[PDB]
């Protein structure tokens, strides 16, 4: 037993300028008949891996919620998207969960997809840190799995030149002092390069985020009563007698 509904709307993704890594956009899908192929089919994918979930399950099981995080990304920088990465990008701009099942897709954009616009260049944060009220002590400020860079409100939509520094003082609420950061740029490639993060959540609600299968009259609860059957109810599997 599964609900009928509509397919996941990825139009927002495909209809504007790609976000920067430290200022990505998040699409949350609930109550949806998803189709992973349809979306990935639109890109000449370069790579796609997962963790704590099979390549099968990622596009065949039901989830309580599906999160898609998309942004512009230099293909050549893929080495720092690892959970055990060096950190220059991972620890400041964007990090992924190691507790929930996740995936990472890196793809280029084909000339046919003219609805998505091309950024001037790539930008990222080199470092982000806080200065204490003594204006002598400095402490690094890192980004967590579902957070934005701690100084995203300081760094502008683009870094004009390498070494550009940005600073603002902190209010008493934060303990005072200053929050400071600096970034760098990477030349744009011939074609737009983009990355997509996927996080899969289970068990926090009805698993109504599913594939799209057809049905029959012999897979109903009614008329199966009293018999031992296998079942799958909104992602909840098991065996028993109704």
């Amino acid at each position, epitope marked *: 037993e599964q609900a009928e509904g509509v397919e996941c709307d990825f139009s927002p993704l495909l209809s504007g300028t790609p976000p920067q890594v430290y200022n990505f956009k998040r699409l949350v899908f609930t109550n949806c008949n998803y189709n992973l192929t349809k979306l990935l089919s639109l890109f000449s994918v370069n790579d796609f891996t997962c963790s704590q979930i099979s390549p099968a399950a990622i596009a065949s099981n039901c989830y309580s919620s599906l999160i898609l995080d998309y942004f512009s990304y230099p293909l050549s920088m893929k080495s720092d998207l690892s959970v055990s990465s060096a950190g220059p990008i991972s620890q400041f701009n964007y990090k992924q969960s190691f507790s929930n099942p996740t995936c990472l897709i890196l793809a280029t954009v084909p000339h046919n997809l003219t609805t998505i616009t091309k950024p001037l260049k790539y930008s990222y944060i080199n470092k982000c840190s806080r200065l204490l009220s003594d204006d002598r002590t400095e402490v690094p400020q890192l980004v967590n799995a579902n957070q934005y860079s701690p100084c995203v409100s300081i760094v502008p939509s683009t870094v004009w030149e390498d070494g550009d*520094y*940005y600073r603002k003082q902190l209010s008493p609420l934060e303990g005072g002092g200053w929050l400071v950061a600096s970034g760098s*740029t990477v030349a744009m490639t011939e074609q737009l390069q983009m990355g997509f993060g996927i996080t899969v959540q289970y068990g926090t609600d009805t698993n109504s985020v599913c594939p799209k299968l057809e049905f029959a009259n012999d897979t109903k609860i009614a008329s199966q009563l009293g018999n031992c059957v296998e079942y799958s109810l909104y992602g909840v599997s098991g065996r028993g007698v109704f």
Partner: antibody
Amino acid sequence: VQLLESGGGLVKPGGSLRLSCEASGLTFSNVWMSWVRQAPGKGLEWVGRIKRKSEGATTDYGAPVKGRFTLSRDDSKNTVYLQMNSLKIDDTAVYYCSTLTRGGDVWSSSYYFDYWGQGALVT
Amino acid sequence: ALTQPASVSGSPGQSITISCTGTSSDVGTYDLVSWYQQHPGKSPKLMIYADIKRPSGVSHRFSGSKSGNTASLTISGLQSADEADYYCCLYAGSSTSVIFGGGTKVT
């Protein structure tokens, strides 16, 4: 502000040439320096630029002279150099020694060339 | 790349414009286009920068304007003394290069 440029002349393709210029009226160590060129009958074309010493005096080059031309500067003389390692016939053009600045701020920058020298011919 | 008219002209006292077009990544998003004026046999001089404003050495006849992905140089009450080659120049910060149009013959 005045920019004095010299070192032009004729060098057969396959050879090499070095241009130089001198700045006066400005604080050399506090400006960016850049070169452009213009061949007869054509529009303007960017050659390359160099940053301040305090910035590591790094450089950026136009594609047309990538791997062939090199920029450098010397703050003890207030001069700039452009050396053309390997010349081609297509490099026939008037070169111009100029400065480069930014307006606005770090949040939103805008770049432009304010001062220009007389220029020199390389052929 | 920047696209400009081959030539623009009119009688002294008239208003003319020189266009400079590109896409959203060139003109639309950022106000960073500059204009230069080059007299025959001479070096170029800066007329307008940041799509809006001029150096104090430039008369009020010259003003900047932008619409969509089109930048332009407006010459209000043009004089015969304004005859020159006008260039549209686009440049951001690092990881890029300076882009010039082919230049417009203004007479």
